[PDB]
From Swiss-Prot, chains A, D, F:
Mg(2+) 3 binds at residues 59, 63. The chain holds residues 405 to 690 of 705 of the full protein. Isopentenyl diphosphate binds at residues 20, 23, 52, 69. Bifunctional terpene synthase that converts dimethylallyl diphosphate (DMAPP) and isopentenyl diphosphate (IPP) into variediene as a single product. The C-terminal prenyltransferase (PT) domain of EvVS catalyzes formation of geranylgeranyl pyrophosphate (GGPP), whereas the N-terminal terpene cyclase (TC) domain catalyzes the cyclization of GGPP to variediene. The PT domain can also synthesize geranylfarnesyl pyrophosphate (GFPP) from the C5 isoprene units in vitro, while the TC domain is able to cyclize GFPP to the sesterterpene (2E)-alpha-cericerene. Residues 1-275 are annotated as: Prenyltransferase. The gene is EvVS. It comes from the Eukaryota. Disulfide bonds: none annotated. It comes from Emericella variicolor (Aspergillus stellatus). This is Variediene synthase. A motif (DDXXD 2) lies at residues 59-63. In the N-terminal section; belongs to the terpene synthase family. In the C-terminal section; belongs to the FPP/GGPP synthase family. Dimethylallyl diphosphate binds at residues 68, 146-147, 185, 192, 200. Hexamer. The conserved DDXXD motifs as well as the NSE/DTE motif are important for the catalytic activity, presumably through binding to Mg(2+). Mg(2+) 4 binds at residues 59, 63.
Amino acid sequence: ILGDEHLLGPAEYISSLPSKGVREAFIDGLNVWLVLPDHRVNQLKSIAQTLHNASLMLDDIEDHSPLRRGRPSTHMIFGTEQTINSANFLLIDVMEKVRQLDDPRCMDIYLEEMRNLFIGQSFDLYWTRNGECPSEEQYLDMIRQKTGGLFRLLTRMMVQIAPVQQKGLETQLASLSDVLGEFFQVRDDYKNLTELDECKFSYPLIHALTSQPKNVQLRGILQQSRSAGGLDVPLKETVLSHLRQAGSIEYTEAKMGELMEKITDSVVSLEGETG
Amino acid sequence: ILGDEHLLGPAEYISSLPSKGVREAFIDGLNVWLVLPDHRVNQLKSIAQTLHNASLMLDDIEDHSPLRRGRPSTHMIFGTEQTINSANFLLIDVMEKVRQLDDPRCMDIYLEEMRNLFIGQSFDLYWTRNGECPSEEQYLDMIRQKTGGLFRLLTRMMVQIAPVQQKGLETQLASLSDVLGEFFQVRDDYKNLTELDECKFSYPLIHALTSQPKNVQLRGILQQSRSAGGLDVPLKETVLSHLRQAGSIEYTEAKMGELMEKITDSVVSLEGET
Amino acid sequence: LGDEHLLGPAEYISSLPSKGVREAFIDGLNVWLVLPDHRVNQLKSIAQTLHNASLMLDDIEDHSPLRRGRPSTHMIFGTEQTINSANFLLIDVMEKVRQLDDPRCMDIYLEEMRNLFIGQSFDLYWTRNGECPSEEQYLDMIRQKTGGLFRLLTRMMVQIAPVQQKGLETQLASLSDVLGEFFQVRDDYKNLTELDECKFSYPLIHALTSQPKNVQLRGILQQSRSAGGLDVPLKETVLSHLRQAGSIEYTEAKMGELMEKITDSVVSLEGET
Amino acid sequence: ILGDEHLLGPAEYISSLPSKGVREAFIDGLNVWLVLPDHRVNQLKSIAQTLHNASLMLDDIEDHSPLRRGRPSTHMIFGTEQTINSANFLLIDVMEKVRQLDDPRCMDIYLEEMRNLFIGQSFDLYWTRNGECPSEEQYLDMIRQKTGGLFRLLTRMMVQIAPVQQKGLETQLASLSDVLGEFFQVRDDYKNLTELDECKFSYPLIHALTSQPKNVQLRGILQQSRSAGGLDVPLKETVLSHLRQAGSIEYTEAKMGELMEKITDSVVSLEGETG
Amino acid sequence: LGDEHLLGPAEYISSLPSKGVREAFIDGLNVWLVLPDHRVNQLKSIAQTLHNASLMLDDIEDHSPLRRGRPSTHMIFGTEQTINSANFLLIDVMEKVRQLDDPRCMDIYLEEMRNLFIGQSFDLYWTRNGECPSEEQYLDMIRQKTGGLFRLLTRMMVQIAPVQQKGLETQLASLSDVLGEFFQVRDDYKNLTELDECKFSYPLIHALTSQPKNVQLRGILQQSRSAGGLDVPLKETVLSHLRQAGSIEYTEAKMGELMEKITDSVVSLEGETG
Amino acid sequence: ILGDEHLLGPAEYISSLPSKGVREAFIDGLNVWLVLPDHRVNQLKSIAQTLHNASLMLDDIEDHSPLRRGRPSTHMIFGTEQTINSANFLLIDVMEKVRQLDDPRCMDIYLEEMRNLFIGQSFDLYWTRNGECPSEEQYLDMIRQKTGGLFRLLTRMMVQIAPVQQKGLETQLASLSDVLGEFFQVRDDYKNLTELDECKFSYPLIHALTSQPKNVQLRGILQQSRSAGGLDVPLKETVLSHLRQAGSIEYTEAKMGELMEKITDSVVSLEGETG
C-alpha cells in the first residue's frame, strides 16, 4: 500500500496555479535585515506557500467562487469534501515543516498565530453570514489577524532562527507586518469596486452604511444580494453610484495614503536602527 | 475584548451532546495494563474527546446529515463555514495538548496517525463521490485507518508515557486497536442496514455487488440514490430485499463472529503475560 | 453484449403483481371462439407484453413514483432505459404476432395500434395544455385508448377462430368498446371517491361544463397544473366542489347505463351461440 | 375521432428541419451495384428517413438537447410525452411501409436489425447513466451495432429487393456498412472534441482514462459534469488540455485513417467482382 | 364588464369560519354610544371588509399555505388576482364610508390608514432585513398595526354617536390601543407555547436582548431565514432557549399588566357612563 | 416617531426613474379646450403621476421583470411585500389629492373609474394565468378599461373642475380617451414583436391563434413558455415566423390605421364644436 493520491490531489492542483509570490518576496525582503542561511529561507518559503494554499482552498469553498485566477477552483475538480480534507491535512504538513526547523519556540509562535488567524476568520464569517455590519474599529482589528496573521507569523519565526543580534527589533517588524496586512486588505477592497456577490462587507461599504443611517436603497440592495445568491450588473452599478455619492472611494484613498505613510516611516526607522 | 464566541461555538455545542463514550472506556481499560497517573489519563481523555468531536463535526457536512443523535447538527445551527473553521481550529487546539504531555515522541505519533486517518477518509470520500465499489480488502484496509486510527493514536501515546516496566506490549495492543476499529465499523454497518440516503458503501453491500455481477436492479437503485440525493422508503425496502437474496447479512454475521474471536484471543494473550 | 440492459425493465415490470383482466377476458372469449390451447397462450403473451409496455410508458408520462405500492420502473432503471425497453417490447410483440400463421393478424395489429396511439395523443394534448374536452370527445378517447387492446385481442381471436364465427364480429367488438369505456369510468370513480398532475376525468368534465362560472375549481386545477400537484386540503376542496355539482351521481348513472349495455350484449351473444 | 394531428405533429416538425442526406447517398451508392427499380429506391429511402427521424427525436430527449441544427428541438415544441408517443408510432409506420416491399424476408431482416439497434442503445444509456467507462472493444462493438445498424438494415434489405442475380455480395456489403458506421461515429467524436456535456464517453476519453489510471483531475471533472448536469467552458478547456497531453487526439486520427483504409480496400474489392 | 375574477378572492375569504372580535367590539361600544341598527351594520360591514383585505395581504406576505385549516386565497386564485382584489377592497370600503353621511369620517379613515400602513411597513422591514427591534419599537409598531382597526372603528362610532357623548374620545381610543396590544401579545404567546417566516415576537425580543452573546439562538434564526423556515427539532431548540431566559414569564407579566389596564379603563368608563 | 421611511421608499424610487410624460402631455392637451387655472392643472398632474407610478409598481411584480428602463425594478430593491404595501397606500394618497379638488362629484368619478380599472386588470390576470385566449372583442374591451381608464378619469375630473359652460363635451372626450388607450395598447403590442416571456396575449397573437385552429406548433411553444417560465430566443423567432406566415402583423397595422383615423375625426369634431 503506497497510495496517497486522493489526499495530495487538491494541494498539488492549487500549487500548480500561477501566483505573484508576495509572501516569498516578503521573506526575501526581511532576510536583508536578518541574515539567514539559504536552506532556512527555503524552509520558511515552503511553510508560507503551503499555508497560503490551504487558506485559498478554504476561502474558495467558503465564498462559492467557481473560478480562481481565471482557472477553475479546486472544489470544482475534486469536490468540497475532498478539498476540505486536503486543507485539514495541510495543517499537519505545515506542522511537520515547522517541526523540522529545530526550534522549540517556533512551536508556540506557530500555534498562537494560527489561533489568532482562526479568530479573525471566524469573526469575518459571522459578519458575512448574519448580515451584521461591523464598525470601522472592529473591521480594522479583524483584518490585522485574518490577513496580517501570516506576515506576523513568518516575521516572528524568521526572527527566532536569526543569528542573535537582531532580537530587539521583533516589535518593529510585527508592527510593520500588521500595517502591511491592513494595506493589502484595504487595497483589495478598493480594487474591487473601481475595477462582493456573496454579501461581503468592505471598507467603502461600512462608511456608506454608517454616514447614512437612513439610506434604505443600499440596505435593500444588500438584502437582495443576501437572499438572492448574488447581484446582477444593473443592481451592481447602483451600489457603485451610492458609494460615489456618499464619498466612500475618497475615504478609502485617505486610509490608503495613511497606511503607506506609516509603512514608509516604519521602514525608515528600521533602516536607521540597523545598518 | 476577547471572548472567542464565534470560534468555540460549534465546539461547545457538539461537546454538549449525549455520547456513548467508547474512547474513554477504551482508555480506562488500557490503563489497567499500563498503569498511569490520573492527570495523564484525564489529559488523554480530553485529547480523544476533542479529536472525536472534530471528526463528528466534519462528517456531518460531508454526509449532509440534518440531525445527530436526534438533535440538529452543528452546521444547521452555526453554518457550514463556521463549523469548518472550528473543526480546523480544534486540530491546532489538540496540537497544543499533545505538547503538554512532556514527550517529543508523542508529537511524532500524533503526526503519523493523523496522516493515516486523513488518507483513509480521503479514500472513503473518493469512493462516495465517484460511485466506485471497492474490493473487500480495500474496504477493510480503509476502515482499519479511518476508524481504528483514533484507537491506535491513543494506544501508542499511552505506552510512551507508561512508567518503564511494560514496554514490549506494543504490537499486541496495536493489533487489538485495529481489530476493535474494524469491529466497530462492521457493527455500525450491520445496525444501520438491519434496523443508503448518502449512498455510502457498506460491508454487506460490497458482497451483494460482487457475488452478483449482473444485478441490474441493485446497481440502478444505487444510482437513483446518488442522482436524486436520497432513497424513499420503498426503495430502501427493495435494497434490503436484494441484500437478503445474496446472503449478505449472514456474511456480515460471520465476519462479526470472526472478529470477536480475534478480540478474545488478543485479550487472553495480553492478560496471560501481564 | 447481451440484453441485460434491454430486458431489465420489461422483466421487472413483469415480475410485479397484477390483476389479470386481459387474460380473463381472453379465456371468457374462448368459450365462444373455441380456440386451441396453444393459441390462447400465445394471445395471452401478446396481451401481457402490450399491457406491460403501456404501463411502462404511462408511469413516465404521468410522473408516478410508485406502482402498486412498489417503486416504478424508471426509478430503478432510468427514463431513457425504460423508453428503450418499451420500444423493444413493441418490436418483440409482433414477432409473436407473426408466429400466429395469419397475414391478416398483422393488418389488425397495425390498425389497432394506430388507434391506440391516436387516443393516447389526444389524452396527452389535453393534459399538457390544460384544455377541457367535451363529453363526446372524452368518450371517444377512452373508447380508443382503453378499449383498443380488447378490440385488438378480440379481432385476432376471431381471425384465428376455427371456421364458423361469421357474425360474431360486430357484437364482440361492441362488447369490447363497452368494456373499455366501463373500465375507465370505474377507475375515474375509484381514484376520486376513495391524479396530482390534473388529469381530466368524467366527474371533472361534468363539473366544469354544468358550472361555467366556477372560478374556484378552475383556480385549483390551475394551481395543480403549475405547482405540480394537489395537497390534501386542495384535493378535499375539489372533491367538495364535485359533490356540490352532482358529478358523483352522474358517474354512477353512466356506470349503470354501461352495465346495461354489457348485460344486453352478453345475452344477445349467448342467444346466438 | 378521426383527426390524426397530435400524433404526426412531431414527425412533421422533425422532417421539416434541414438534413444532409447521408442515408439517401448510401442508397444511391449501393444502387449502382444492385441496380433495383426507382419506386423501390424511393420506398427504401422513405423507410430510412422515417427511422432516422424517430432515432433523432428520441436521442434529443435522451440527451437534453434544447437545439437541433440551430433550431429548437422537437420536445421543446410538443413536450416529452407527445414526442415519445410520435416516435413510438413511427416504428409501426415504418413497419407498414416495409410490408409494401412485397417480401416476407424483409420483415425478418427489419425485426432482427432493430434488436441490435436497441441493444446498442441500451448499452450506451447504461454506460452514460452509471458513469462506467467501457473498454475500447466494448465501445467499438456498441458503435458497430448502434450506428451501423441502419446501414446494415438498408443494405440487407437492398439485396433481397434487388433483381435476383447478385446474391453472394451480401457479407461484403455488410462489412462495408459496419466499417462505415464506425467511421461516422469516430468522426463525430473527433469533431465534437477538436472544435460530453451530458457525460457521454468518446473514443479519446477512453484512451485518456485507460493510459493514465491515476489522473484524478480528469475523473473529478467528469464527475462534476454528472453532478451539475453539464460543463462550463473553463472546465471543458481543462478536459481538452488533458486529452491533448495524453495523445488521444492523435490516437483518434490513427483510428480514422485505419478505418478509411479499410473502407477503400472494401470498395476496391467490391468493384473487382462487378462491372 | 361582468365582475368576477375581482370579487371571487374576496368572497372566498368572506365565506370562511371566523371569530368576530371586531363585531363584538362594535356591539360592546354601542352600549356606551347607542347607534341605530343601520349604522351599526354599516360599520360591521366596513370592519369585515377591512379585516378580510388585511388577511388576504398577510397570507401572501407570509407564504402561509393554509388559513383556519383551509387553503389560502392565493393558493386558489394566485398572488396577482388576490392582490388586485385586496386593492379593490380599499376602494369598496371608501365607497361604504362615504355612505355614513359625514365628511369627518372620511378624514378619520384616511388618517388611520396611514398609521396602519406605517406599522405594516416597519413590520415588513424588520422581517425582511433580519433587524431586531427594541421592546419600545415593537410595542409602538403593534399599537398601529393591530390596534389600527379598533381605533378607526372607535373614532367613527363617536362621530356618528347621537347625543354627542362629550369626551369619551381619549378613553375609548386608549382602550382600543391597549386591546390591540393585548391581542398581539396573546397571539405571540399562543403561537410559541401551543418562526417559519422569521417573524419577531415579545419573547424572542426579550431573549435576544437579555443575552447578547447567545450565538445559538441567532444562528437558528439565521438558518430559518436562509432555508425558508425551520423544522420541528429546531423549533424545539428555540423553545428550549426561550424557557431559559424567562421569556414566557416576561410575556405573562406583560399580559397581566395589559389586562389590569383594560379593567381599569373599563371601570373608569363605566363610572361616568353608568 | 415620524416614520414614513419604509412607506415612501418605493414610491420615491419609482418617481425618480425617467419617464415620457404621456399623461402630463394629455392633461396639457385638453387644457386648451378646458381653460383651467394653473394650480388645478398641477394637482391633476400630481394625481395622474402617482396613479401611474402605483400601476407600474404593481405591474412589474405581476410580470417578474428585473429591469425597468434599464434600471433595476422596484421589487429588487425593497422586496415584493414592501412594494405591495407602498402601492396599496398610494391609493390612499391619491385619495387626499382628489379630496383637495373641492368638488363632491370628483370623489365619485374616482371610485367608478378605479372599479373599471380593476375589472380590466382582473380579466388580464385571469387570461394570463389560466392559459385562455380571449376573443378579439373581449381583448378590446379589456384594453379599453385597463389602459384607457386613467385617461377617462383625468378627462372627467378636468371637465368637472372646468367652468360649467364647457361641460357638454365629456362624451366626445371620453370616446377620444378610449380610442387613445386602445391605440397605445395596440402600439405596445406591435412594438414588442417588431423590435410571451410571461405568456401574455397580444393583438397579433389572438389573430394567429384564431385564424389557425389546427396550428399545434404555436400552441406548443406558448405552453412551453407557460411551463418553463419564458421563451429562449430561437423559440421567439419561431413565434415571429408563425405570426408572419399567418399574416398577423398586417392585421395590426390595419388596426392602428383605423384607430388613428378615428382619433383624427374625433379631434376634428371637437375643434369644430369649439373655436
